[PDB]
Amino acid sequence: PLRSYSFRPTYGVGHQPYRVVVLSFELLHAPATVCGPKKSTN
Amino acid sequence: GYFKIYSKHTPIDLPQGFSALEPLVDLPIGINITRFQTLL
């Protein structure tokens, strides 16, 4: 049912190991708890 | 969607006095509390 990528260190750029991080987000009515740094001045 | 707990501890039916509970913890929890039970 499923085959294998099988990369080599000589493949064309083409089919080369590419890492992917999908950062799905949420906006449910439940309170937000993930936020950015929120920089601060002096 | 926030779970808030206020608390106060005193040394002493219930006492016939006034004391205001202070904020202990607000937690972003997320559940929809409908029932509860004590643990001893």
PDB file of N, CA, C and O in Angstrom:
ATOM      1  N   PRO A   1       0.807  -1.227   0.000  1.00  0.00           N
ATOM      2  CA  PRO A   1       0.000   0.000   0.000  1.00  0.00           C
ATOM      3  C   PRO A   1       0.837   1.272   0.000  1.00  0.00           C
ATOM      4  O   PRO A   1       0.384   2.296  -0.511  1.00  0.00           O
ATOM      5  N   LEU A   2       2.043   1.208   0.563  1.00  0.00           N
ATOM      6  CA  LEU A   2       2.884   2.382   0.743  1.00  0.00           C
ATOM      7  C   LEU A   2       4.332   2.050   0.412  1.00  0.00           C
ATOM      8  O   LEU A   2       4.876   1.042   0.868  1.00  0.00           O
ATOM      9  N   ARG A   3       4.954   2.921  -0.382  1.00  0.00           N
ATOM     10  CA  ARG A   3       6.329   2.793  -0.840  1.00  0.00           C
ATOM     11  C   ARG A   3       7.222   3.713   0.000  1.00  0.00           C
ATOM     12  O   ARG A   3       6.748   4.303   0.985  1.00  0.00           O
ATOM     13  N   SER A   4       8.497   3.830  -0.373  1.00  0.00           N
ATOM     14  CA  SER A   4       9.461   4.554   0.443  1.00  0.00           C
ATOM     15  C   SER A   4      10.182   5.606  -0.387  1.00  0.00           C
ATOM     16  O   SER A   4      10.519   5.365  -1.550  1.00  0.00           O
ATOM     17  N   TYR A   5      10.435   6.763   0.235  1.00  0.00           N
ATOM     18  CA  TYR A   5      11.082   7.886  -0.437  1.00  0.00           C
ATOM     19  C   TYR A   5      12.503   7.535  -0.868  1.00  0.00           C
ATOM     20  O   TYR A   5      12.861   7.702  -2.038  1.00  0.00           O
ATOM     21  N   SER A   6      13.320   7.048   0.068  1.00  0.00           N
ATOM     22  CA  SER A   6      14.666   6.584  -0.247  1.00  0.00           C
ATOM     23  C   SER A   6      15.552   7.661  -0.867  1.00  0.00           C
ATOM     24  O   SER A   6      15.942   7.546  -2.032  1.00  0.00           O
ATOM     25  N   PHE A   7      15.878   8.709  -0.107  1.00  0.00           N
ATOM     26  CA  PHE A   7      16.751   9.777  -0.583  1.00  0.00           C
ATOM     27  C   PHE A   7      18.206   9.331  -0.530  1.00  0.00           C
ATOM     28  O   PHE A   7      18.593   8.525   0.320  1.00  0.00           O
ATOM     29  N   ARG A   8      19.024   9.895  -1.442  1.00  0.00           N
ATOM     30  CA  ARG A   8      20.477   9.763  -1.435  1.00  0.00           C
ATOM     31  C   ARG A   8      21.134  11.129  -1.250  1.00  0.00           C
ATOM     32  O   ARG A   8      20.508  12.160  -1.507  1.00  0.00           O
ATOM     33  N   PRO A   9      22.402  11.175  -0.817  1.00  0.00           N
ATOM     34  CA  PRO A   9      23.079  12.474  -0.679  1.00  0.00           C
ATOM     35  C   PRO A   9      23.570  13.028  -2.006  1.00  0.00           C
ATOM     36  O   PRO A   9      24.403  13.937  -2.031  1.00  0.00           O
ATOM     37  N   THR A  10      23.085  12.466  -3.114  1.00  0.00           N
ATOM     38  CA  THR A  10      23.430  12.966  -4.440  1.00  0.00           C
ATOM     39  C   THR A  10      22.220  13.287  -5.303  1.00  0.00           C
ATOM     40  O   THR A  10      22.406  13.765  -6.425  1.00  0.00           O
ATOM     41  N   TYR A  11      20.997  13.064  -4.824  1.00  0.00           N
ATOM     42  CA  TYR A  11      19.787  13.332  -5.592  1.00  0.00           C
ATOM     43  C   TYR A  11      19.789  14.760  -6.124  1.00  0.00           C
ATOM     44  O   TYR A  11      20.470  15.630  -5.570  1.00  0.00           O
ATOM     45  N   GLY A  12      19.034  15.018  -7.190  1.00  0.00           N
ATOM     46  CA  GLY A  12      18.859  16.380  -7.660  1.00  0.00           C
ATOM     47  C   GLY A  12      18.110  17.183  -6.620  1.00  0.00           C
ATOM     48  O   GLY A  12      17.537  16.587  -5.704  1.00  0.00           O
ATOM     49  N   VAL A  13      18.085  18.512  -6.730  1.00  0.00           N
ATOM     50  CA  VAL A  13      17.494  19.323  -5.666  1.00  0.00           C
ATOM     51  C   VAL A  13      16.057  18.862  -5.488  1.00  0.00           C
ATOM     52  O   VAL A  13      15.695  18.344  -4.427  1.00  0.00           O
ATOM     53  N   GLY A  14      15.229  19.072  -6.506  1.00  0.00           N
ATOM     54  CA  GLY A  14      14.208  18.105  -6.853  1.00  0.00           C
ATOM     55  C   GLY A  14      13.653  17.333  -5.678  1.00  0.00           C
ATOM     56  O   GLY A  14      13.103  17.893  -4.728  1.00  0.00           O
ATOM     57  N   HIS A  15      13.809  16.016  -5.763  1.00  0.00           N
ATOM     58  CA  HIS A  15      13.408  15.098  -4.711  1.00  0.00           C
ATOM     59  C   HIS A  15      14.492  15.005  -3.642  1.00  0.00           C
ATOM     60  O   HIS A  15      15.319  14.090  -3.677  1.00  0.00           O
ATOM     61  N   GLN A  16      14.496  15.935  -2.692  1.00  0.00           N
ATOM     62  CA  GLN A  16      15.474  15.944  -1.614  1.00  0.00           C
ATOM     63  C   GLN A  16      14.753  16.044  -0.280  1.00  0.00           C
ATOM     64  O   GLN A  16      13.625  16.548  -0.218  1.00  0.00           O
ATOM     65  N   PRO A  17      15.379  15.577   0.805  1.00  0.00           N
ATOM     66  CA  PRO A  17      14.727  15.657   2.118  1.00  0.00           C
ATOM     67  C   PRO A  17      14.346  17.082   2.477  1.00  0.00           C
ATOM     68  O   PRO A  17      15.212  17.957   2.583  1.00  0.00           O
ATOM     69  N   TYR A  18      13.056  17.324   2.679  1.00  0.00           N
ATOM     70  CA  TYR A  18      12.544  18.634   3.039  1.00  0.00           C
ATOM     71  C   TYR A  18      11.690  18.463   4.282  1.00  0.00           C
ATOM     72  O   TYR A  18      10.685  17.738   4.255  1.00  0.00           O
ATOM     73  N   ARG A  19      12.114  19.097   5.370  1.00  0.00           N
ATOM     74  CA  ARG A  19      11.375  19.062   6.618  1.00  0.00           C
ATOM     75  C   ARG A  19      10.215  20.037   6.545  1.00  0.00           C
ATOM     76  O   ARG A  19      10.351  21.146   6.023  1.00  0.00           O
ATOM     77  N   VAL A  20       9.065  19.615   7.064  1.00  0.00           N
ATOM     78  CA  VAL A  20       7.859  20.430   7.046  1.00  0.00           C
ATOM     79  C   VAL A  20       7.258  20.434   8.442  1.00  0.00           C
ATOM     80  O   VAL A  20       7.085  19.372   9.053  1.00  0.00           O
ATOM     81  N   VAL A  21       6.941  21.624   8.946  1.00  0.00           N
ATOM     82  CA  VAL A  21       6.205  21.791  10.192  1.00  0.00           C
ATOM     83  C   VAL A  21       4.953  22.591   9.856  1.00  0.00           C
ATOM     84  O   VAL A  21       5.028  23.780   9.524  1.00  0.00           O
ATOM     85  N   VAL A  22       3.799  21.937   9.941  1.00  0.00           N
ATOM     86  CA  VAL A  22       2.510  22.597   9.763  1.00  0.00           C
ATOM     87  C   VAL A  22       2.037  23.075  11.131  1.00  0.00           C
ATOM     88  O   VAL A  22       1.739  22.266  12.013  1.00  0.00           O
ATOM     89  N   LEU A  23       1.971  24.389  11.313  1.00  0.00           N
ATOM     90  CA  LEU A  23       1.583  24.974  12.592  1.00  0.00           C
ATOM     91  C   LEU A  23       0.121  25.412  12.530  1.00  0.00           C
ATOM     92  O   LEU A  23      -0.208  26.587  12.389  1.00  0.00           O
ATOM     93  N   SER A  24      -0.767  24.426  12.640  1.00  0.00           N
ATOM     94  CA  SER A  24      -2.194  24.711  12.684  1.00  0.00           C
ATOM     95  C   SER A  24      -2.535  25.532  13.922  1.00  0.00           C
ATOM     96  O   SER A  24      -1.963  25.338  14.996  1.00  0.00           O
ATOM     97  N   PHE A  25      -3.479  26.458  13.770  1.00  0.00           N
ATOM     98  CA  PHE A  25      -3.910  27.327  14.855  1.00  0.00           C
ATOM     99  C   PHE A  25      -5.377  27.066  15.170  1.00  0.00           C
ATOM    100  O   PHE A  25      -6.085  26.380  14.427  1.00  0.00           O
ATOM    101  N   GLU A  26      -5.829  27.623  16.293  1.00  0.00           N
ATOM    102  CA  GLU A  26      -7.182  27.410  16.791  1.00  0.00           C
ATOM    103  C   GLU A  26      -7.749  28.744  17.259  1.00  0.00           C
ATOM    104  O   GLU A  26      -7.011  29.657  17.636  1.00  0.00           O
ATOM    105  N   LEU A  27      -9.074  28.866  17.207  1.00  0.00           N
ATOM    106  CA  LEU A  27      -9.741  30.053  17.727  1.00  0.00           C
ATOM    107  C   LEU A  27     -11.057  29.702  18.412  1.00  0.00           C
ATOM    108  O   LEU A  27     -12.008  30.488  18.367  1.00  0.00           O
ATOM    109  N   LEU A  28     -11.128  28.530  19.041  1.00  0.00           N
ATOM    110  CA  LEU A  28     -12.338  28.126  19.749  1.00  0.00           C
ATOM    111  C   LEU A  28     -12.730  29.186  20.772  1.00  0.00           C
ATOM    112  O   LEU A  28     -11.904  30.021  21.154  1.00  0.00           O
ATOM    113  N   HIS A  29     -13.990  29.166  21.219  1.00  0.00           N
ATOM    114  CA  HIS A  29     -14.431  30.147  22.208  1.00  0.00           C
ATOM    115  C   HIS A  29     -13.705  29.975  23.534  1.00  0.00           C
ATOM    116  O   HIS A  29     -13.707  30.893  24.363  1.00  0.00           O
ATOM    117  N   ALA A  30     -13.088  28.824  23.757  1.00  0.00           N
ATOM    118  CA  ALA A  30     -12.342  28.624  24.986  1.00  0.00           C
ATOM    119  C   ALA A  30     -11.200  29.638  25.055  1.00  0.00           C
ATOM    120  O   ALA A  30     -10.690  30.066  24.012  1.00  0.00           O
ATOM    121  N   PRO A  31     -10.788  30.059  26.250  1.00  0.00           N
ATOM    122  CA  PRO A  31      -9.815  31.151  26.345  1.00  0.00           C
ATOM    123  C   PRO A  31      -8.524  30.833  25.606  1.00  0.00           C
ATOM    124  O   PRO A  31      -8.030  29.704  25.626  1.00  0.00           O
ATOM    125  N   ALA A  32      -7.979  31.852  24.953  1.00  0.00           N
ATOM    126  CA  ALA A  32      -6.688  31.731  24.296  1.00  0.00           C
ATOM    127  C   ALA A  32      -5.603  31.638  25.363  1.00  0.00           C
ATOM    128  O   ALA A  32      -5.629  32.329  26.383  1.00  0.00           O
ATOM    129  N   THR A  33      -4.627  30.769  25.132  1.00  0.00           N
ATOM    130  CA  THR A  33      -3.578  30.534  26.113  1.00  0.00           C
ATOM    131  C   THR A  33      -2.209  30.477  25.446  1.00  0.00           C
ATOM    132  O   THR A  33      -1.187  30.355  26.128  1.00  0.00           O
ATOM    133  N   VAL A  34      -2.177  30.557  24.118  1.00  0.00           N
ATOM    134  CA  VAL A  34      -0.937  30.595  23.351  1.00  0.00           C
ATOM    135  C   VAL A  34      -0.824  31.987  22.751  1.00  0.00           C
ATOM    136  O   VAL A  34      -1.707  32.420  22.007  1.00  0.00           O
ATOM    137  N   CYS A  35       0.263  32.689  23.055  1.00  0.00           N
ATOM    138  CA  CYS A  35       0.422  34.074  22.639  1.00  0.00           C
ATOM    139  C   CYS A  35       1.885  34.358  22.343  1.00  0.00           C
ATOM    140  O   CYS A  35       2.775  33.607  22.749  1.00  0.00           O
ATOM    141  N   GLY A  36       2.128  35.448  21.620  1.00  0.00           N
ATOM    142  CA  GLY A  36       3.470  35.862  21.296  1.00  0.00           C
ATOM    143  C   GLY A  36       4.160  36.539  22.462  1.00  0.00           C
ATOM    144  O   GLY A  36       3.564  36.775  23.517  1.00  0.00           O
ATOM    145  N   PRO A  37       5.437  36.881  22.284  1.00  0.00           N
ATOM    146  CA  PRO A  37       6.237  37.398  23.405  1.00  0.00           C
ATOM    147  C   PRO A  37       5.663  38.627  24.092  1.00  0.00           C
ATOM    148  O   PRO A  37       5.823  38.777  25.307  1.00  0.00           O
ATOM    149  N   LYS A  38       5.002  39.514  23.349  1.00  0.00           N
ATOM    150  CA  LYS A  38       4.507  40.757  23.933  1.00  0.00           C
ATOM    151  C   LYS A  38       5.658  41.577  24.508  1.00  0.00           C
ATOM    152  O   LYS A  38       5.784  41.714  25.728  1.00  0.00           O
ATOM    153  N   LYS A  39       6.520  42.088  23.631  1.00  0.00           N
ATOM    154  CA  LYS A  39       7.643  42.923  24.029  1.00  0.00           C
ATOM    155  C   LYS A  39       7.192  44.083  24.921  1.00  0.00           C
ATOM    156  O   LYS A  39       6.027  44.488  24.926  1.00  0.00           O
ATOM    157  N   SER A  40       8.148  44.622  25.678  1.00  0.00           N
ATOM    158  CA  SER A  40       7.887  45.692  26.634  1.00  0.00           C
ATOM    159  C   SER A  40       8.963  46.759  26.507  1.00  0.00           C
ATOM    160  O   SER A  40      10.134  46.438  26.291  1.00  0.00           O
ATOM    161  N   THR A  41       8.560  48.023  26.646  1.00  0.00           N
ATOM    162  CA  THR A  41       9.474  49.160  26.627  1.00  0.00           C
ATOM    163  C   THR A  41      10.081  49.374  28.007  1.00  0.00           C
ATOM    164  O   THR A  41       9.730  48.671  28.960  1.00  0.00           O
ATOM    165  N   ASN A  42      10.999  50.328  28.125  1.00  0.00           N
ATOM    166  CA  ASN A  42      11.477  50.765  29.425  1.00  0.00           C
ATOM    167  C   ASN A  42      10.425  51.651  30.093  1.00  0.00           C
ATOM    168  O   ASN A  42       9.407  52.008  29.495  1.00  0.00           O
TER     169      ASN A  42
ATOM    170  N   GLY B   1     -15.033  30.362  30.265  1.00  0.00           N
ATOM    171  CA  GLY B   1     -14.131  29.243  30.075  1.00  0.00           C
ATOM    172  C   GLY B   1     -12.954  29.251  31.027  1.00  0.00           C
ATOM    173  O   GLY B   1     -12.024  28.453  30.880  1.00  0.00           O
ATOM    174  N   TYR B   2     -12.981  30.149  32.005  1.00  0.00           N
ATOM    175  CA  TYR B   2     -11.956  30.236  33.030  1.00  0.00           C
ATOM    176  C   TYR B   2     -12.493  29.676  34.338  1.00  0.00           C
ATOM    177  O   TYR B   2     -13.647  29.915  34.706  1.00  0.00           O
ATOM    178  N   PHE B   3     -11.644  28.927  35.037  1.00  0.00           N
ATOM    179  CA  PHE B   3     -11.976  28.365  36.342  1.00  0.00           C
ATOM    180  C   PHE B   3     -11.310  29.227  37.407  1.00  0.00           C
ATOM    181  O   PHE B   3     -10.080  29.254  37.506  1.00  0.00           O
ATOM    182  N   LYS B   4     -12.117  29.926  38.197  1.00  0.00           N
ATOM    183  CA  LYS B   4     -11.621  30.834  39.218  1.00  0.00           C
ATOM    184  C   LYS B   4     -11.839  30.241  40.598  1.00  0.00           C
ATOM    185  O   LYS B   4     -12.916  29.718  40.901  1.00  0.00           O
ATOM    186  N   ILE B   5     -10.804  30.325  41.428  1.00  0.00           N
ATOM    187  CA  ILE B   5     -10.836  29.849  42.801  1.00  0.00           C
ATOM    188  C   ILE B   5     -10.402  30.989  43.702  1.00  0.00           C
ATOM    189  O   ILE B   5      -9.297  31.526  43.542  1.00  0.00           O
ATOM    190  N   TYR B   6     -11.270  31.348  44.646  1.00  0.00           N
ATOM    191  CA  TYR B   6     -10.948  32.258  45.732  1.00  0.00           C
ATOM    192  C   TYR B   6     -10.945  31.459  47.024  1.00  0.00           C
ATOM    193  O   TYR B   6     -11.673  30.477  47.151  1.00  0.00           O
ATOM    194  N   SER B   7     -10.132  31.873  47.988  1.00  0.00           N
ATOM    195  CA  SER B   7     -10.034  31.085  49.207  1.00  0.00           C
ATOM    196  C   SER B   7      -9.668  31.969  50.383  1.00  0.00           C
ATOM    197  O   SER B   7      -9.106  33.051  50.217  1.00  0.00           O
ATOM    198  N   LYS B   8      -9.988  31.477  51.575  1.00  0.00           N
ATOM    199  CA  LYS B   8      -9.600  32.135  52.815  1.00  0.00           C
ATOM    200  C   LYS B   8      -9.538  31.101  53.928  1.00  0.00           C
ATOM    201  O   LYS B   8     -10.424  30.248  54.038  1.00  0.00           O
ATOM    202  N   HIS B   9      -8.498  31.184  54.751  1.00  0.00           N
ATOM    203  CA  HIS B   9      -8.310  30.294  55.886  1.00  0.00           C
ATOM    204  C   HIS B   9      -8.340  31.102  57.175  1.00  0.00           C
ATOM    205  O   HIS B   9      -7.677  32.137  57.283  1.00  0.00           O
ATOM    206  N   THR B  10      -9.107  30.626  58.151  1.00  0.00           N
ATOM    207  CA  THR B  10      -9.245  31.312  59.425  1.00  0.00           C
ATOM    208  C   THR B  10      -9.202  30.274  60.532  1.00  0.00           C
ATOM    209  O   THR B  10      -9.530  29.109  60.289  1.00  0.00           O
ATOM    210  N   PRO B  11      -8.736  30.637  61.728  1.00  0.00           N
ATOM    211  CA  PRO B  11      -8.992  29.794  62.904  1.00  0.00           C
ATOM    212  C   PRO B  11     -10.228  30.225  63.681  1.00  0.00           C
ATOM    213  O   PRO B  11     -10.396  31.416  63.961  1.00  0.00           O
ATOM    214  N   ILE B  12     -11.093  29.277  64.040  1.00  0.00           N
ATOM    215  CA  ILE B  12     -12.341  29.603  64.730  1.00  0.00           C
ATOM    216  C   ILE B  12     -12.184  29.342  66.220  1.00  0.00           C
ATOM    217  O   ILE B  12     -11.145  28.865  66.669  1.00  0.00           O
ATOM    218  N   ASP B  13     -22.672  24.319  62.249  1.00  0.00           N
ATOM    219  CA  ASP B  13     -22.821  25.767  62.242  1.00  0.00           C
ATOM    220  C   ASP B  13     -21.624  26.418  61.560  1.00  0.00           C
ATOM    221  O   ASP B  13     -20.643  25.742  61.242  1.00  0.00           O
ATOM    222  N   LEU B  14     -21.711  27.728  61.323  1.00  0.00           N
ATOM    223  CA  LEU B  14     -20.621  28.492  60.743  1.00  0.00           C
ATOM    224  C   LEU B  14     -20.431  29.769  61.550  1.00  0.00           C
ATOM    225  O   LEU B  14     -21.385  30.259  62.169  1.00  0.00           O
ATOM    226  N   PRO B  15     -19.226  30.331  61.561  1.00  0.00           N
ATOM    227  CA  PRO B  15     -18.988  31.540  62.357  1.00  0.00           C
ATOM    228  C   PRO B  15     -19.856  32.698  61.886  1.00  0.00           C
ATOM    229  O   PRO B  15     -20.192  32.814  60.707  1.00  0.00           O
ATOM    230  N   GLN B  16     -20.224  33.553  62.832  1.00  0.00           N
ATOM    231  CA  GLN B  16     -21.053  34.719  62.547  1.00  0.00           C
ATOM    232  C   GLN B  16     -20.202  35.964  62.319  1.00  0.00           C
ATOM    233  O   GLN B  16     -20.394  36.997  62.957  1.00  0.00           O
ATOM    234  N   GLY B  17     -19.249  35.866  61.393  1.00  0.00           N
ATOM    235  CA  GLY B  17     -18.347  36.950  61.081  1.00  0.00           C
ATOM    236  C   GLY B  17     -18.250  37.191  59.584  1.00  0.00           C
ATOM    237  O   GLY B  17     -18.838  36.475  58.770  1.00  0.00           O
ATOM    238  N   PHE B  18     -17.496  38.231  59.240  1.00  0.00           N
ATOM    239  CA  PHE B  18     -17.280  38.621  57.854  1.00  0.00           C
ATOM    240  C   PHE B  18     -15.797  38.515  57.534  1.00  0.00           C
ATOM    241  O   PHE B  18     -14.960  39.048  58.269  1.00  0.00           O
ATOM    242  N   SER B  19     -15.482  37.832  56.437  1.00  0.00           N
ATOM    243  CA  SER B  19     -14.127  37.772  55.908  1.00  0.00           C
ATOM    244  C   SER B  19     -14.227  37.530  54.412  1.00  0.00           C
ATOM    245  O   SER B  19     -14.995  36.668  53.976  1.00  0.00           O
ATOM    246  N   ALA B  20     -13.459  38.285  53.632  1.00  0.00           N
ATOM    247  CA  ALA B  20     -13.577  38.265  52.182  1.00  0.00           C
ATOM    248  C   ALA B  20     -12.550  37.320  51.575  1.00  0.00           C
ATOM    249  O   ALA B  20     -11.348  37.458  51.817  1.00  0.00           O
ATOM    250  N   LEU B  21     -13.027  36.366  50.781  1.00  0.00           N
ATOM    251  CA  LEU B  21     -12.137  35.427  50.117  1.00  0.00           C
ATOM    252  C   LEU B  21     -11.302  36.144  49.064  1.00  0.00           C
ATOM    253  O   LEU B  21     -11.793  37.020  48.350  1.00  0.00           O
ATOM    254  N   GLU B  22     -10.028  35.771  48.973  1.00  0.00           N
ATOM    255  CA  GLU B  22      -9.094  36.439  48.088  1.00  0.00           C
ATOM    256  C   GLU B  22      -8.804  35.581  46.862  1.00  0.00           C
ATOM    257  O   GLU B  22      -8.833  34.351  46.943  1.00  0.00           O
ATOM    258  N   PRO B  23      -8.524  36.188  45.713  1.00  0.00           N
ATOM    259  CA  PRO B  23      -8.267  35.385  44.516  1.00  0.00           C
ATOM    260  C   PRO B  23      -7.099  34.443  44.742  1.00  0.00           C
ATOM    261  O   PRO B  23      -6.008  34.860  45.132  1.00  0.00           O
ATOM    262  N   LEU B  24      -7.339  33.156  44.510  1.00  0.00           N
ATOM    263  CA  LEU B  24      -6.291  32.156  44.638  1.00  0.00           C
ATOM    264  C   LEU B  24      -5.698  31.814  43.278  1.00  0.00           C
ATOM    265  O   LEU B  24      -4.506  32.032  43.050  1.00  0.00           O
ATOM    266  N   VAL B  25      -6.520  31.314  42.355  1.00  0.00           N
ATOM    267  CA  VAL B  25      -6.022  30.977  41.021  1.00  0.00           C
ATOM    268  C   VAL B  25      -7.124  31.081  39.976  1.00  0.00           C
ATOM    269  O   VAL B  25      -8.233  30.577  40.172  1.00  0.00           O
ATOM    270  N   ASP B  26      -6.817  31.711  38.850  1.00  0.00           N
ATOM    271  CA  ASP B  26      -7.643  31.627  37.653  1.00  0.00           C
ATOM    272  C   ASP B  26      -6.913  30.749  36.645  1.00  0.00           C
ATOM    273  O   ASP B  26      -5.753  31.015  36.316  1.00  0.00           O
ATOM    274  N   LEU B  27      -7.587  29.705  36.162  1.00  0.00           N
ATOM    275  CA  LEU B  27      -6.978  28.720  35.280  1.00  0.00           C
ATOM    276  C   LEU B  27      -7.705  28.676  33.944  1.00  0.00           C
ATOM    277  O   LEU B  27      -8.944  28.642  33.927  1.00  0.00           O
ATOM    278  N   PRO B  28      -6.990  28.668  32.812  1.00  0.00           N
ATOM    279  CA  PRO B  28      -7.663  28.624  31.505  1.00  0.00           C
ATOM    280  C   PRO B  28      -8.317  27.291  31.173  1.00  0.00           C
ATOM    281  O   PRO B  28      -8.856  27.158  30.069  1.00  0.00           O
ATOM    282  N   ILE B  29      -8.257  26.314  32.079  1.00  0.00           N
ATOM    283  CA  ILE B  29      -8.926  25.016  31.984  1.00  0.00           C
ATOM    284  C   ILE B  29      -9.577  24.793  30.623  1.00  0.00           C
ATOM    285  O   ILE B  29      -8.884  24.518  29.638  1.00  0.00           O
ATOM    286  N   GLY B  30     -10.902  24.911  30.545  1.00  0.00           N
ATOM    287  CA  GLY B  30     -11.596  24.756  29.279  1.00  0.00           C
ATOM    288  C   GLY B  30     -12.817  23.859  29.331  1.00  0.00           C
ATOM    289  O   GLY B  30     -13.586  23.801  28.367  1.00  0.00           O
ATOM    290  N   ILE B  31     -13.010  23.151  30.442  1.00  0.00           N
ATOM    291  CA  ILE B  31     -14.126  22.221  30.591  1.00  0.00           C
ATOM    292  C   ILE B  31     -15.394  22.973  30.975  1.00  0.00           C
ATOM    293  O   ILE B  31     -15.367  24.185  31.215  1.00  0.00           O
ATOM    294  N   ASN B  32     -16.510  22.252  31.026  1.00  0.00           N
ATOM    295  CA  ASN B  32     -17.844  22.827  31.158  1.00  0.00           C
ATOM    296  C   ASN B  32     -18.513  22.290  32.422  1.00  0.00           C
ATOM    297  O   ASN B  32     -19.621  21.755  32.393  1.00  0.00           O
ATOM    298  N   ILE B  33     -17.825  22.445  33.553  1.00  0.00           N
ATOM    299  CA  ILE B  33     -18.209  21.861  34.836  1.00  0.00           C
ATOM    300  C   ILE B  33     -19.716  21.934  35.039  1.00  0.00           C
ATOM    301  O   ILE B  33     -20.326  22.995  34.877  1.00  0.00           O
ATOM    302  N   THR B  34     -20.320  20.802  35.397  1.00  0.00           N
ATOM    303  CA  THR B  34     -21.738  20.729  35.717  1.00  0.00           C
ATOM    304  C   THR B  34     -22.019  20.059  37.053  1.00  0.00           C
ATOM    305  O   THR B  34     -23.031  20.365  37.683  1.00  0.00           O
ATOM    306  N   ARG B  35     -21.145  19.159  37.494  1.00  0.00           N
ATOM    307  CA  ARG B  35     -21.254  18.477  38.775  1.00  0.00           C
ATOM    308  C   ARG B  35     -19.859  18.393  39.378  1.00  0.00           C
ATOM    309  O   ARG B  35     -18.856  18.650  38.706  1.00  0.00           O
ATOM    310  N   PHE B  36     -19.791  18.044  40.658  1.00  0.00           N
ATOM    311  CA  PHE B  36     -18.517  18.001  41.360  1.00  0.00           C
ATOM    312  C   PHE B  36     -18.691  17.189  42.636  1.00  0.00           C
ATOM    313  O   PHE B  36     -19.809  16.980  43.109  1.00  0.00           O
ATOM    314  N   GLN B  37     -17.566  16.734  43.183  1.00  0.00           N
ATOM    315  CA  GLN B  37     -17.587  15.923  44.393  1.00  0.00           C
ATOM    316  C   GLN B  37     -16.295  16.117  45.173  1.00  0.00           C
ATOM    317  O   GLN B  37     -15.217  16.246  44.585  1.00  0.00           O
ATOM    318  N   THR B  38     -16.415  16.125  46.498  1.00  0.00           N
ATOM    319  CA  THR B  38     -15.263  16.324  47.369  1.00  0.00           C
ATOM    320  C   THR B  38     -14.406  15.065  47.444  1.00  0.00           C
ATOM    321  O   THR B  38     -14.893  13.950  47.240  1.00  0.00           O
ATOM    322  N   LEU B  39     -13.121  15.252  47.758  1.00  0.00           N
ATOM    323  CA  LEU B  39     -12.137  14.176  47.852  1.00  0.00           C
ATOM    324  C   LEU B  39     -11.492  14.200  49.227  1.00  0.00           C
ATOM    325  O   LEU B  39     -10.850  15.189  49.604  1.00  0.00           O
ATOM    326  N   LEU B  40     -11.631  13.091  49.941  1.00  0.00           N
ATOM    327  CA  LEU B  40     -11.025  12.903  51.245  1.00  0.00           C
ATOM    328  C   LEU B  40     -10.267  11.578  51.293  1.00  0.00           C
ATOM    329  O   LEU B  40      -9.461  11.340  52.192  1.00  0.00           O
TER     330      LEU B  40
END
